[PDB]
Write an enzyme that holds these catalytic residues in place. Structure first.
Site, mmCIF file in Angstrom:
data_model
loop_
_atom_site.group_PDB
_atom_site.id
_atom_site.type_symbol
_atom_site.label_atom_id
_atom_site.label_comp_id
_atom_site.label_asym_id
_atom_site.label_seq_id
_atom_site.Cartn_x
_atom_site.Cartn_y
_atom_site.Cartn_z
ATOM 1 N N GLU A 196 0.834 -1.208 0.000
ATOM 2 C CA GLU A 196 0.000 0.000 0.000
ATOM 3 C C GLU A 196 0.866 1.255 0.000
ATOM 4 O O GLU A 196 0.588 2.231 -0.739
ATOM 5 C CB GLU A 196 -0.967 0.006 1.176
ATOM 6 C CG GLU A 196 -2.135 -0.985 1.076
ATOM 7 C CD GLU A 196 -3.207 -0.612 0.053
ATOM 8 O OE1 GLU A 196 -3.115 0.443 -0.586
ATOM 9 O OE2 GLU A 196 -4.012 -1.517 -0.227
ATOM 10 N N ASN A 225 -7.509 8.877 -5.794
ATOM 11 C CA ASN A 225 -8.278 7.847 -6.469
ATOM 12 C C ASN A 225 -9.086 8.506 -7.578
ATOM 13 O O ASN A 225 -9.420 9.683 -7.524
ATOM 14 C CB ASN A 225 -9.205 7.138 -5.456
ATOM 15 C CG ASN A 225 -8.450 6.485 -4.275
ATOM 16 O OD1 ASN A 225 -8.906 6.567 -3.128
ATOM 17 N ND2 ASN A 225 -7.288 5.966 -4.517
ATOM 18 N N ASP A 241 -12.346 8.469 -8.128
ATOM 19 C CA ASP A 241 -13.572 9.084 -7.688
ATOM 20 C C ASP A 241 -13.370 10.418 -6.976
ATOM 21 O O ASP A 241 -14.343 11.012 -6.515
ATOM 22 C CB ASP A 241 -14.375 8.033 -6.877
ATOM 23 C CG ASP A 241 -13.738 7.728 -5.487
ATOM 24 O OD1 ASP A 241 -12.635 8.253 -5.186
ATOM 25 O OD2 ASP A 241 -14.403 7.036 -4.704
ATOM 26 N N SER A 294 -11.567 10.815 -4.131
ATOM 27 C CA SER A 294 -11.123 10.578 -2.793
ATOM 28 C C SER A 294 -9.605 10.412 -2.883
ATOM 29 O O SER A 294 -9.047 10.307 -3.951
ATOM 30 C CB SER A 294 -11.821 9.352 -2.221
ATOM 31 O OG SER A 294 -11.422 8.191 -2.908
ATOM 32 N N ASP A 298 -6.262 8.318 -0.666
ATOM 33 C CA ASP A 298 -5.817 7.305 0.284
ATOM 34 C C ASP A 298 -4.603 7.892 1.090
ATOM 35 O O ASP A 298 -3.734 8.556 0.502
ATOM 36 C CB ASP A 298 -5.343 6.073 -0.416
ATOM 37 C CG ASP A 298 -6.450 5.285 -1.100
ATOM 38 O OD1 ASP A 298 -7.629 5.337 -0.699
ATOM 39 O OD2 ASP A 298 -6.067 4.508 -1.987
ATOM 40 N N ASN A 318 -8.971 5.440 2.901
ATOM 41 C CA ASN A 318 -9.644 6.358 1.963
ATOM 42 C C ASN A 318 -10.571 7.396 2.618
ATOM 43 O O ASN A 318 -11.285 7.106 3.562
ATOM 44 C CB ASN A 318 -10.421 5.496 0.969
ATOM 45 C CG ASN A 318 -10.949 6.260 -0.206
ATOM 46 O OD1 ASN A 318 -12.156 6.607 -0.230
ATOM 47 N ND2 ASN A 318 -10.123 6.483 -1.188
ATOM 48 N N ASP A 325 -15.521 -4.591 8.798
ATOM 49 C CA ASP A 325 -16.667 -4.043 8.044
ATOM 50 C C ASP A 325 -17.409 -5.137 7.286
ATOM 51 O O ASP A 325 -18.507 -4.884 6.784
ATOM 52 C CB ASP A 325 -16.188 -2.935 7.074
ATOM 53 C CG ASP A 325 -17.307 -2.189 6.368
ATOM 54 O OD1 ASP A 325 -18.109 -1.558 7.070
ATOM 55 O OD2 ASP A 325 -17.329 -2.248 5.114
#
EC number: 3.2.1.17
Length: 129
Positions: A35, A46, A48, A50, A52, A59, A101
């Protein structure tokens, strides 16, 4: 901060990630490697809109607030900048929420593509933990 491999392993272990939700410490170290290359300051936009943040590339659409991601939920209740600290506590606490989650560590696409099903214990080999 750029962690060493064993250095990060120890920190993650102290913060209770070893076997958290059943994922052995090598899984967490391998995820962080791919990562962020173990760099707390890593950031990546990203598609969209957003971004990270941090060692585990958490995110801003769901988990932290960066003030620039519309429809952001801030489920970890933290500014995204907290995820860039040399102190990994905030990243760990937020990672614990993420992995709980529903999809486990598949939440980290790098983990699924580069760590899942591999010999992840190699990532803690040689360390005194």
């Amino acid at each position: 901060k750029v962690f060493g491999r064993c250095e990060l392993a120890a920190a993650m272990k102290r913060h209770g990630l070893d076997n958290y939700r059943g994922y052995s410490l090598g899984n967490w170290v391998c995820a962080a490697k791919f990562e962020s290359n173990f760099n707390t300051q890593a950031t990546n936009r990203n598609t969209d809109g957003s971004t990270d943040y941090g060692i585990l590339q958490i995110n801003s659409r769901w988990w932290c607030n960066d003030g620039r991601t519309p429809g952001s939920r801030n489920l970890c209740n933290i500014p995204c900048s907290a995820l860039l600290s040399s102190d990994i506590t905030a990243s760990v606490n937020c990672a614990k929420k993420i992995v709980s989650d529903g999809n486990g560590m598949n939440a980290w696409v790098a983990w699924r593509n580069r760590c899942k099903g591999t010999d992840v214990q190699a990532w803690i080999r040689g360390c005194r933990l």
